[PDB]
Every structure is written in structure tokens, then in C-alpha cells.
Design a protein around this ligand. Structure first.
Ligand code: ON2
Length: 198
């Protein structure tokens, strides 16, 4: 049921928005804010442990959004018959690693770009709610997934700006734990880059 899926998803988004610390960690001391990045990266790490993702690129944008790009297969784009929406929309919205739906719920905005089967697919979310169905925007010979999110400053207080060093420490750690995955970190605010690989 297209319909029952939509009702269940919106109850899930409401649950996360009302009790955000329960899902992401402390919303004031910066740990929940940085965990937003690490949850997205952990999904790319899963796609590396599956053996398709070899490189993960984490970018801090000058507007204080963060993007995570992988070179994996790309989140599946076909209509999942039960929910009647793209398998990507299901992954991005269904509550379950805390699940990328938690990051989506707690993002003012989220941009999804999927490259696979020779096409580029894009979708925009606001507070976990898709603006429109996943749509093809052009062709590509590449594969992978890009998630860019703008954290809600309704949810997150006090520590609101991403700290390069906090991201660098956990990404260095994840590269140590995941031998042969390359994890790049880029700060568009000041030109800092790192390249973690073990
Ligand atoms: C940054 C990022 N990356 C991902 C990400 O790649 N997740 C993915 N989940 C799946 C699940 C299934 C498949 N199966 C096929 O392709 C079947 C083809 N016969 C591919 C992927 S790829 C997520 Cl989720 C996030 Cl967030």
C-alpha cells in the first residue's frame, strides 16, 4: 500500500523530530550534529564492505551543509511495488547504524543524487519529506550515491557548525577499521583536505 507506507513514514519522521536525541545523540553538545555525517558515511561503509564502494568523499560546504559521495552501485532507483515509490525514497524515509532516514528527518533540506544504469537521478527532501518522486536529470557512465544535507537549526543548538577536526578523527578511525577503503575529507570553507587510507 502506497497509502499505508506514506502514513507510516510521516509518523516515523514526526517521532524522530519530537525525540531527536533518542535517535541521533545530544542535540546541544555537537555529538548529535557530527553523528549526522557519520550515519551517512556508515551507509557508504556498508557499500564498501559489500565490495562495490572503494572511495568515500566527505565535503564541508561553505553554507555549512555536508555532502557524502561514494563510488558504490548507487542506491536502487526502481519503483518498489509495495510502497509504489523508488527503492531510494524507501531507504531515505523508512525508520530503522540509526538509519539514513534519521539524518533526513533532522535535515532542513537533503539532496540525493544517484548515478546508475547510465542515468543520473535526483530528489530533494525537506524535513525528511520528498518534494517530488526521484527523477532522471541526465545520463552518466559513473555509479554511486551523493547525499548532501543541511542540518535543522531547530533541532540542533549551541554547536551548529561542523568542526573539521571532529570529522577528521572519526573518518581516520573508520579508514583504520575498514582496511582498503579510501576516505577523503574536503573543507570548502578554507581549502583543507585529508586522505585517510589503511
Ligand atoms: C552514501 C550512501 N550510499 C548508500 C548506498 O550505496 N547504499 C546502497 N544500498 C544498496 C542496496 C541494494 C543494492 N542492490 C543493487 O544494486 C542490486 C542490483 N542487482 C545496492 C545498494 S547501494 C547509502 Cl544508503 C548512502 Cl546514505
Amino acid at each position: 500500500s502506497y497509502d499505508s507506507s506514506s502514513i507510516k513514514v510521516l509518523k516515523g519522521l514526526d517521532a524522530v523530530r519530537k525525540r531527536p536525541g533518542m535517535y541521533i545523540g545530544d542535540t546541544d553538545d555537537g555529538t548529535g550534529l557530527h553523528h549526522m555525517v557519520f550515519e551517512v558515511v556508515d551507509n557508504a561503509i556498508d557499500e564498501a564492505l559489500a565490495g562495490h564502494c572503494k572511495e568515500i568523499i566527505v565535503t564541508i560546504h561553505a553554507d555549512n551543509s555536508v555532502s557524502v559521495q561514494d563510488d558504490g552501485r548507487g542506491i536502487p532507483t526502481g519503483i518498489h511495488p509495495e510502497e509504489g515509490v523508488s527503492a531510494a525514497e524507501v531507504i531515505m524515509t523508512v525508520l530503522h547504524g540509526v538509519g539514513v532516514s534519521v539524518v533526513n528527518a533532522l535535515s532542513q533540506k537533503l539532496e540525493l543524487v544517484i548515478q546508475r544504469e547510465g542515468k543520473i537521478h535526483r530528489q530533494i527532501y525537506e524535513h525528511g519529506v520528498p518534494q517530488a518522486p526521484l527523477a532522471v536529470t541526465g545520463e552518466t557512465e559513473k555509479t554511486g550515491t551523493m547525499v548532501r544535507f543541511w542540518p535543522s537549526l531547530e533541532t540542533f543548538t549551541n554547536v551548529t557548525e561542523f568542526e573539521y577536526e571532529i570529522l577528521a578523527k572519526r573518518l581516520r578511525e573508520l579508514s583504520f577499521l575498514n582496511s582498503g577503503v579510501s576516505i577523503r575529507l574536503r573543507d570548502k570553507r578554507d581549502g583543507k583536505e585529508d586522505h585517510f587510507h589503511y
